[PDB]
Paper text:
Thymidine phosphorylase, providing pyrimidine nucleotides for DNA repair and replication, has also been shown to have angiogenic activity in vivo. Here, we report the crystal structures of recombinant native hTP and in complex with 5-iodouracil (5IUR), a substrate with a Ki of 0.48 mM.
The crystal structure of native hTP (at 3.0 Å) consists of two non-crystallographic dimers in the asymmetric unit. All four copies of hTP contain residues 34–479, residues 32 and 33 can be observed for chains A and B while only residue 33 can be observed for molecule C. At the C-terminal end, residue 480 was observed only in chain B. The crystal structure of hTP–5IUR complex (at 2.5 Å) consists of a dimer per asymmetric unit. No secondary structure differences were observed between native hTP, hTP–5IUR complex structure and the previously reported hTP structures. The ‘key hydrogen bond’ between His150 and Ala239 previously proposed to form the phosphate-binding site is present in both bound and unbound hTP structures. It is evident that presence of substrate analogue is not required for the enzyme to acquire the ‘closed’ conformation.
Numbering used by the authors: 32 to 479
């Protein structure tokens, strides 16, 4: 029954299970206001150090979900509601494209997304690079968006998965993100509130992924598919590598550009690879395409013929962006899009030390330095340096020459410190091996 908050915390601290009553009451305290900051962090920490189990976990997610509302849409759309959701992520703008992609493929995507988590920027912050983009819509507005645009991207609020919003902000600045339960709940809860026909989850592994260990990551996959099943959700989880940044831009505004470059015609191969791959899965899974190949084939199609660029345009406008700016952003050249989005003060470039063959660029050192540069959050509720970020000037598998520039840093301060500099420079790994074509960051596809 109603136990005082400090008491539930004492229980988890002591490795005790939380009852459905206990989890619920807690969730409520968090949304109703009673629960104080130091209390929410304490609990998150306790959880990050004693975990929970299938039930508590399943209970948590399930509750979080109902802290707010659930959406209901015209029965017409039903079989067309789909969504994908990542975990880790350094430079993962897939969402910024796969959304309008699917919307061009006749699907409706009601995306409840999020902000940077730990050292992994969020697709919600990235969108806020676009001037006037509102990530907060009421269910009502959302339904207008899936009608006009077919898709939309919004974050937690007073009506949607409220409690998740409270924790998710804390998780990131409390060093309480890497927890299978808090992860499973955080994700499933949002996607639940949407009520989708099919749902694909992006589970990163290696390098800069929340859970580095491939297998210990593959579990997180069978898990989200696990609980997700029970909750009554069709869930497909795919393990994709995260040792190097997806694409060539890590940041916010920079990333919004490398996304437009995709819809345009095509930018980075890996970026496209996943958008089509994951996209084709959703169509197959939602039973909207013969096989994944066919599925994936239609998405690629969207990419190549301006569809996604169109859907995307309606979307920005539909979500607060000055119509004019939006036609300018999409029909704009890359040079235009640069002068229209947030740019950092100065920007230097790291040169190649030795002749050699780019083996890979270390994602973690990057994300970590850029974080220190204002591309990451230090303490919830704070602005973000949206211009700041980084550009990969060489592509993995290729051969570069000593002295050539391989990475450009956009910073808002008067310079990089010694530690930050060395950090960057060593994130570059060179071999004498012969140049080669980059592999797909896509590994397996855990099914339900």
């Amino acid at each position: 029954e109603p136990k005082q908050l400090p008491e539930l915390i004492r229980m988890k601290r002591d490795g005790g299970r939380l009852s459905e009553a206990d989890i619920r009451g807690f969730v409520a305290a968090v949304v109703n206001g009673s629960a104080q900051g130091a209390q929410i962090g304490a609990m998150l920490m306790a959880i990050r150090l004693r975990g929970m189990d299938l039930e508590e976990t399943s209970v948590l997610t399930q509750a979080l979900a109902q802290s707010g509302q659930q959406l209901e849409w015209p029965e017409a759309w039903r079989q067309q509601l789909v969504d994908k959701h990542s975990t880790g992520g350094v430079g993962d703008k897939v969402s910024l494209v796969l959304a309008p992609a699917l919307a061009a493929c006749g699907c409706k995507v009601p995306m409840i997304s999020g902000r940077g988590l730990g050292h992994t920027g969020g697709t919600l912050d990235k969108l806020e690079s676009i001037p006037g983009f509102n990530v907060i819509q009421s269910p009502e507005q959302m339904q207008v968006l899936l009608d006009q645009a077919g898709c939309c991207i919004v974050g937690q609020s007073e009506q949607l998965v409220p409690a998740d919003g409270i924790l998710y902000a804390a998780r990131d600045v409390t060093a309480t993100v890497d927890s299978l339960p808090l992860i499973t709940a955080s994700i499933l809860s949002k996607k639940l509130v949407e009520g989708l026909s099919a749902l694909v989850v992006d589970v990163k592994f290696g390098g800069a992924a929340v859970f580095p260990n491939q297998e210990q990551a593959r579990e997180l996959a069978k898990t989200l598919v696990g609980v997700g099943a029970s909750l009554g959700l069709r869930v497909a989880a795919a393990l994709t590598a995260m040792d190097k940044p997806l694409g060539r831009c890590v940041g916010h505004a920079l990333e919004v550009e490398e996304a437009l470059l995709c819809m345009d015609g095509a930018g980075p191969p890996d970026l496209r690879d996943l958008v089509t791959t994951l996209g084709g899965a959703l169509l197959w899974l939602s039973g909207h395409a013969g096989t994944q190949a066919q599925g994936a084939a239609r998405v690629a199609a969207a990419l190549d013929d301006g569809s996604a660029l169109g859907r995307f345009e309606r979307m920005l406008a539909a979500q607060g962006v000055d119509p004019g700016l939006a036609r300018a952003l999409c029909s704009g050249s890359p040079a235009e899009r640069r002068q229209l989005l947030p740019r950092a003060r100065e920007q230097e470039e790291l040169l190649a030390p030795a002749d050699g063959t780019v083996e890979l660029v270390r994602a973690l050192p990057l994300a970590l330095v850029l974080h220190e540069l204002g591309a990451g959050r230090s303490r919830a509720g704070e602005p973000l340096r949206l211009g700041v970020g980084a550009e990969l000037l060489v592509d993995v598998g290729q051969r570069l020459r000593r002295g050539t520039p391989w990475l450009r840093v956009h910073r808002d301060g008067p310079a990089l410190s010694g530690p930050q500099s060395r950090a960057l420079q060593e994130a570059l790994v060179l071999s004498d091996r012969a140049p080669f074509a980059a592999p797909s960051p896509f590994a397996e596809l855990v099914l339900p």
